[PDB]
Amino acid sequence: TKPCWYWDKKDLAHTPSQLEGLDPATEARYRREGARFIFDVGTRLGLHYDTLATGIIYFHRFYMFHSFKQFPRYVTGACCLFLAGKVEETPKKCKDIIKTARSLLNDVQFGQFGDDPKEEVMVLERILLQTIKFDLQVEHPYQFLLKYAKQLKGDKNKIQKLVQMAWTFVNDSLCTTLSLQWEPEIIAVAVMYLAGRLCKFEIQEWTSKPMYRRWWEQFVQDVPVDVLEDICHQILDLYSQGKQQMPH
Amino acid sequence: MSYNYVVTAQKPTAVNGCVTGHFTSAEDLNLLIAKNTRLEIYVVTAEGLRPVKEVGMYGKIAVMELFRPKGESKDLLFILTAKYNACILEYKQSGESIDIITRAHGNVQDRIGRPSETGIIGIIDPECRMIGLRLYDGLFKVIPLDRDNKELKAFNIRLEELHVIDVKFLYGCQAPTICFVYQDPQGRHVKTYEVSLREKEFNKGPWKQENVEAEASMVIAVPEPFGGAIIIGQESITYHNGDKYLAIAPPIIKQSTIVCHNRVDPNGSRYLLGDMEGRLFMLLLEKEEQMDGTVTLKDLRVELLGETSIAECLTYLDNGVVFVGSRLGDSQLVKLNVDSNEQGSYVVAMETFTNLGPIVDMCVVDLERQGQGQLVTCSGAFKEGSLRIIRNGQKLHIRTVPLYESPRKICYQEVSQCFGVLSSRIEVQDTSGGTTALRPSASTQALSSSVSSSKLFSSSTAPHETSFGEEVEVHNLLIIDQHTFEVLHAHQFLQNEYALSLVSCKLGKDPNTYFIVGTAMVYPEEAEPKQGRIVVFQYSDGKLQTVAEKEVKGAVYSMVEFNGKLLASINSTVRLYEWTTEKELRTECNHYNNIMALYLKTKGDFILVGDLMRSVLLLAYKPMEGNFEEIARDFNPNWMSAVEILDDDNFLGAENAFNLFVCQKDSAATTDEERQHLQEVGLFHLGEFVNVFCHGSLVMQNLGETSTPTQGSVLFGTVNGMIGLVTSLSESWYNLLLDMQNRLNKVIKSVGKIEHSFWRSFHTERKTEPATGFIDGDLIESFLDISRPKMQEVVANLQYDDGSGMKREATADDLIKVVEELTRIH
Amino acid sequence: TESDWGKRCVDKFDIIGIIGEGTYGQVYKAKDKDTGELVALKKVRLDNEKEGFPITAIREIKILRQLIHRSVVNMKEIVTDKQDALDFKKDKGAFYLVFEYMDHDLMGLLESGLVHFSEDHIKSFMKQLMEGLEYCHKKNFLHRDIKCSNILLNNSGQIKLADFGLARLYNSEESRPYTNKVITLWYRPPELLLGEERYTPAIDVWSCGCILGELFTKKPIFQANLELAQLELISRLCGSPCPAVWPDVIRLPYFNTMKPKKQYRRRLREEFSFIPSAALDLLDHMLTLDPSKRCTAEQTLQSDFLKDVELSKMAPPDLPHWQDCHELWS
Predict the structure, then answer these.
(1) Dihedral class, residue B84 (left if φ above 0, else alpha if ψ from -120 to 50, else beta)
(2) Shortest CA gap B765–chain C (Å)
(3) Second CATH level (architecture) for the domain B731-823
(4) Is residue C145 annotated as part of the catalytic site, yes or no?
(5) Are C111 and B764 in contact (CB < 8 Å)?
(6) Which residue out of C88, C171, C176 would a mutagenesis test of the A interface target, given it has the greatest number of A Cβ atoms within 10 Å?
(7) Residue B204 in contact with residue B190, Cβ under 8 Å?
(8) Which of A93, A123, A136 faces C51 most closely, judged by CB atoms?
(9) How far apart are CA A142 and CA A57, in angstroms?
């Protein structure tokens, strides 16, 4: 019926890119750069946050089946955003994506698009569709962050601080392979869990079950703390590796 | 775009309705006969009928009734067309000048309504106060006959009874009253309402509802001396009037359904009844006068008079003369005698009026080697079945070959100097377990005879129980000599086997010329036939030999010879068979993208497929590959009645709505999609139901015949006997004749003031489109009959184009010459 | 696996013929070589390369892999032309969307004049259509192109909704600007004629009400070629748009611009007097001018006309058969 789009962390040691001699750090960098390229190009074009995320998910899934050495990332990214716009009903003309991609990329980077940028992108749409197995519908942590937050009642100002901080962590998790490890429902819980720890909030008090200390179990069944901690560790690693710090 | 021309070679001959009255003068006795789109007016004499006037109307005549409102000297005529054009007509004569006056007119179509099963019904009040129309289920439309209603404005009265069988205005009522039979889940019932023009609604009727026979078919409004109504059924005739109720159920009428009625005595004492087997009855109202001075109905009696043609309409004229209007056979004048003849009959035929009847099939053949061509038609049904040989010589000469059974398909085999004709006759389950024919006919009157002994379906194990009295069809192949038209041989097909298609041809390397028949095993239980045969016969030395048989899994609706191969359509499949050196049929290739492949035509390696609901498809045989290729389909859905190939690019089709259309390859090779779309470039409302298209012409060819502007010749036969002709034009000639039509329509006065453009508009229940790509040649040929002032008025400011001179003005003498050449194609 | 779409080749189908011309390609009837099942293949041509894979097809792939309903057409898989070996740039081969083949489409049956609907047949037809629509509306999807041609019918009596090329998600909380001109004029709701642009799922209901009437009349109810002419015809039967019946009509862009000849009164019950009472009430509610007062799909399923209809009995219509080829002599 429907395909499986989730892998184990250990499996990422065997992507096509890794097996062609790319080391784990380089593929991680190529993924951040491609995701952020998708994010920045679409933000300049005024695109909805779901449209950006969908393109990024296509992008991440694509390079579970192909190598970064044979498919230039920025072309792939532009193609994913181009298709994402049509899937999410926020369409853009390919020429406009190229225009924006040229504005943001230097001369070396834009060399990936070759002599005819639009053609390189439009041609890839075929491989993209076959690669993502024509499974175009994607759900993202954002909707669950909001669906679950609405069921919290208490200090409006503390809950909105929780949401925005969690929302930021969702945007930051798009640069990582968490999209390929855990369903979005779990991601949304993990970012609520993380923000709560950082803001020193006890979310259970805001739930309909204020003495149920594992507050997330009413939103997402069968999620151990092991998973939420693994996700939190991966998100904060991005902040520690860079110079940026937790939003707070 | 495509340009075509359509003319009538023979006008409709079937009688659709007939009335009597005092229409031309308050003094004369008139007979008005309605053929499709044609009104014939006669005056009754002691010898027969004197014709006086005939008019055409731009519409199918659905209702025709004569009435005389208070203040009029003579009867007026009401006509309603099948497109809901209503009008009131008056006859006016000034010496030698006869014209028809349109007194009132309008279109009574409703925006929202469901057309009724039993069709349009129109009746008029005995006091001529209103016209009642039953057009849609659940609605009764009233046109009040006030002198100011010159537009025939009307209103609808809600009618609770949705399924009405028949309705009539009653005599002898205090208010306008309707009596009608209707059907609901509890059976059929008879009911009355009163019609109030003041309130514009129904009021409670004079007498209560009564339950009536399940197959109660017709309502008779009995005149003032008796009053009330008579209800005709399959088994019984009943009289209803308040508290009075009679019922006679003579076994005589159960045998055949009664379809028509007429009043003999104005007081209602005697009526005529006719049935589908051609029997003519007298229905007698036996009077009993009480000492009160009142007159009541004592009893009913039915008496068999004799046999007539299967009549759509009867009308008693005067003395002993009755006019029999026949749609399935020739119409007649017959005389009813008081004394029976030595055979027991009171009916003796006086005159016989030719009716080409339903033209089921036809072919054109050069019998005498004249290069002219004669048309042999399968005409009529049941006892009226016939073969009609038609030649041009200024009238058409028609020869009739009586068959007394239904002719289905015809094909000519020159090698054998004979025709092959498929026919079916009605037998009835009898006490022997077998069946018995109601009369002898062509298949039982053959010189030599044979019966299929095929064992293909003999395994059966499928039960089909028979009840005494039920009808069955028995199908035969008739071999008929081309000079004597004597039935030389009759081959009877298997029990429950229908013969659907017939060809005469040579196949492969076989030098023998065969008759090939495609059949279907028809059982009442099945929705679509699932068994059938293709049978190869050889007619040699007076006997028919079965040469080979091929079993198929469906009905062989159509067959056509394809370059030494046999092309046959079996249900959805279109198949091409090869004829082997072992004299057996071998399948080469198939095409399956059809719903029901009813019709087939070929030109070269191209095939035109006509479908039940998917219009027409253009196939091609690919000899390099040994298979079919879909070239182009007409995706506009139509219910087809016949198809024909005009040329390599244009294709002609006929709809079950009485419409013609032409499809063409879009001839634009930009995209594959454009080529695969057949575009309907011609649309035309014919007004007739076309069964058979056939290439050929009836005109004499000495070859000294001037080359007409028209190119090509397709004849077609219709259900009402009308024979027409379709031919092609150049763009230059189309524009000239089209521009002339628009001018003629402004000049010529239409009966009922019906717009010609409206009449020819493509019309289904769902859509209406303006005609395109078709010249109404019958309109063009009327230019020669309009007066000189009108002719010159037409040619004013008329220019020719694309000719020897790019712009050239037309004169009335110039166009007279052009039309006269156009009359020479038929 | 069954889920790895886009790889299997169209070689696996014997093409029977072209059943229709679509929007993004031609639709072909075909037989599966392995199972024998009959399918309908919607061809997707990306060769234009103007904007790549057509969005109309993307909508149908995105939505119909989510929707599971007996009355909603199922996309079985997506297959491709023989792809050029490892040269994707030159590769211009097409994709095909595989669907279950349905025997007929309502337009074809009605246009040919070869279908008769009893009340019980209309009940089974409408109940399936409303259930399919309710499923879609419950999932917050709009069809936006309800037409008789988009209602496929098998001879068993099963109905399925088909062309989801214009279908989009509906958000109640947030109004989104959509495309004003979506439904074909004959089935277009009055609100879109005046240009709401922010329309409700009630647009689909109006279309299905137009079908309900057409099944009883056998002729489409509102046939016009121009948008103003359509408003006039609708206005004559359903009443002229006026503030009393449609309080918010004044905000619609073209209300002052597009006005009927008169302020017609509602005549629907009078003109459809022949329709059974249980059905007439459904039509009155389905053909309500104000989208906020127009009934929902669920409300139609909880109507006297449809609530007690049992889908175990599908009641097939009186469909084309063999004697329909022969004309009756008497």
Answers:
(1) left
(2) 6
(3) Orthogonal Bundle (1.10)
(4) yes
(5) yes
(6) C88
(7) no
(8) A93
(9) 14
Provide the token pair at A79: 């193609």
B613 Rama class: left (phi>0) / alpha (psi -120 to 50) / beta: alpha
* Structural domains in chain A plus CATH codes: 1-137 (1.10.472.10), 138-248 (1.10.472.10)
Nearest in space to B604 (alpha carbons), one of B567, B558, B573, B632: B567
Task: Record the resolution, in angstroms.
Answer: 3.0
Q: What is the CATH superfamily name and number for domain B4-353?
A: YVTN repeat-like/Quinoprotein amine dehydrogenase (2.130.10.10)
Are C4 and A3 spatial neighbours (Cβ–Cβ below 8 Å)?
A: yes
Residues B728, B3 contacting (CB under 8 angstroms): yes
Looking at beta carbons, which residues of chain C come within 8 Å of A136?
Answer: 58, 61-62, 65
Q: CB atoms < 10 A from the CB of C192, how many?
A: 23
What's A55's DSSP letter?
Answer: H
Give the gap in angstroms from C-alpha C235 to the nearest C-alpha of chain B.
13
Residue keyed to tokens 């080829």: C325
A94 within 8 A of C49, measured Cβ to Cβ: no
Residue type at B687 in one-letter notation: G
3-state SS assignment for residue B813: helix
User: Could you say which of C41, C76, C100 is where a domain stops?
Assistant: C100
In a domain, C134, yes or no: yes
Q: Whose CA is closest to B180, among B167, B193, B165, B171?
A: B167
d(CA B674, CA B664): 11
In this structure, the strands spanning B627-633 and B640-645 are unpaired
In the numeric block, which tokens belong to residue B556? 């062989």
- A69, A204 contact by CB (below 8 A): no
Report how far residue B2's alpha carbon sits from residue B704's, in angstroms, rounded to the nearest whole number.
Answer: 29
Query: How does DSSP assign B160-210, residue by residue?
Result: S--EEEEEEEPSS-SS-EEEEEEEETTEEEEEEEEEETTTTEEEE-SS--E
CB of C17 within 8 Å of a chain A CB? The answer is no
CB distance B514 to B577 below 8 Å:
no
Amino acid at B2: S
User: Do strands B321-325 and B556-562 pair parallel, antiparallel, or not at all (unpaired)?
Assistant: unpaired
Amino acid at B186: Q
Nearest partner of C189 among C241, C140, C152, C149, judged by Cα: C241
Phi, psi torsion values for C122, nearest 5 degrees = -65, -40
Report the residue count for chain A: 248
Is residue C217 located within the same domain as residue C285? Answer: yes
Q: How many Å from the N-terminal Cα to the C-terminal Cα in chain A?
A: 43
End-to-end Cα, chain C, rounded Å: 60
User: Distance (Å, rounded) from C-alpha C291 to C-alpha C238?
Assistant: 13
- Beta-strand relationship, C95-100 and C38-44: antiparallel
Which residue bears the tokens 């048309």? B375
Spatial neighbors of C236 by CB under 8 A, at least 6 apart, are B111, C260, C264, C267
Q: Please judge whether C17 and B592 are an interchain contact, meaning their C-beta atoms are less than 8 angstroms apart.
A: yes
Between CA B539 and CA B448 the distance in angstroms is: 12
Whether C219 and chain B come into contact, CB under 8 Å, resolves to yes
| Total Cβ atoms within 10 A of residue B461 | 4
Burial of C156 (0-12, 13-18, 19+ CB in 10 A): exposed
For residues C162-179, one letter each, b for 16 or more C-beta atoms within 10 angstroms of the residue's C-beta and e for the rest, the string is bbbbbbbebeeeeeeebe
Residues contacting residue C95 through CB under 8 Å, at least 6 positions apart? A129, C6, C43, C44, C46, C53, C78, C79, C80, C81
Pairing of strands B774-776, B768-769: unpaired
Please give the C-alpha separations between residue C6 and each of A123, B248, B704, C97, in angstroms, as whole numbers. 16, 76, 68, 9
Binding-face residues of C in 23-52 toward A, CB within 8 A = 46, 49, 51-52
Q: Which two tokens stand for residue C295?
A: 């009934």
Q: How far is CA C174 from the centre of its chain?
A: 25
